[PDB]
């Protein structure tokens, strides 16, 4: 567990990692996956939730038997100019099925004009950087999340 919770760097939620701690959120369901999201998006790391994180990045089934842990890592994962190394998936043609990962970077075609692998005015890079800043409101600050399956 030390290699996970006490890890130096955490993964982005789109590229999440798979591998008595009771003594910010320790909600257990019916009773390890690593990534960083902002605090307001932690509620989507629960069964039956919707949103950009729950639908495009990390999806939990309603049949989930496990525990969702999280803590504020603003002190670690924020730079004063913004930490743009953490990203999430803004665009996707469908929602992920439970426990599915998407690390692709194909350009999202939002209009009739094909992209052919190039970002354009209506051709989006599908990942959006967080730009975590230490003075952001705590709901916008980064939270490390560990989901025990």
């Amino acid at each position, epitope marked *: 567990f030390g290699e996970v919770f006490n890890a130096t760097r955490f993964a982005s939620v789109y590229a999440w990692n798979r591998k008595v701690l009771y003594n910010s959120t320790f909600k257990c369901y019916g009773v390890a996956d690593s990534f960083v999201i902002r605090g307001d998006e932690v509620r989507q790391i629960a069964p039956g939730q919707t949103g950009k994180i729950a639908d495009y990045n990390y999806k939990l089934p309603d049949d989930f038997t496990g525990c969702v842990i999280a803590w504020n890592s603003n002190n670690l994962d924020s730079k004063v*100019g913004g930490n743009y190394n953490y990203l999430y998936r803004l665009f996707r043609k469908s929602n992920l099925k439970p426990f599915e990962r998407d690390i692709s970077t194909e350009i999202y075609q939002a209009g009739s004009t094909p992209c052919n692998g190039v970002e354009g005015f209506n051709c989006y890079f599908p990942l959006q950087s967080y730009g975590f800043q230490p003075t952001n409101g705590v709901g*916008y600050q980064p939270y490390r999340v560990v989901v025990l399956s």
Partner: antibody
Amino acid sequence: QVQLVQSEAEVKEPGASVEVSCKASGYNFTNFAISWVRQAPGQGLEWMGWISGYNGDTNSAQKFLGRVTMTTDTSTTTAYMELRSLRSDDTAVYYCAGSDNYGFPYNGMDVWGQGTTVTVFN
Amino acid sequence: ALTQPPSASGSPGQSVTISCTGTSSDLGAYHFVTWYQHYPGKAPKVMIYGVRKRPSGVPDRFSGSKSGNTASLTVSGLQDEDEADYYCSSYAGNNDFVFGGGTKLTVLG
């Protein structure tokens, strides 16, 4: 990329309503998001709202919530913007702008109209 | 609304940077910062979209970037054709936009 054609200048009186047309000029608005942006004399650009010519998704700025109605007839490929109960500070140039997009134009608007001056006279 | 200086200026050839301050729910949250060039009378023209990308035909002397809640547009080698109003704008998070107040860019004569 100015290509949309808008209706002629309008002269209205306080409390009247106005409707500005914006004809696609050769495109088909079925694959176009449409936005409306106004500029009052001596002020900056002001986003009024947007409608999707694909599925009709609409959103309006909180300033104009309840006062504006945007529609599209892709039959004629024409966008329409109605502004109700004009005040004197509604005197502005009104632009329609578009982009090839079936959803929201996150990057903004690529294609523009020439503008339509609407004067609420005193 | 976003915040812009009223006036930015330089002599022909110099570099000018116009800053634009937003919040963590628009500028800080997205890479959908677009800069519009405007001359009252004509229609707005996109100069920079995304945050730093140039539509084709826009001179490479236009560049853009952002840091935290502050975006910026830099024009290198100022030319008289660049004198105009410039508006920063951003996706605001709920299928909407937020505009700055505009900045007049003057080629100092």
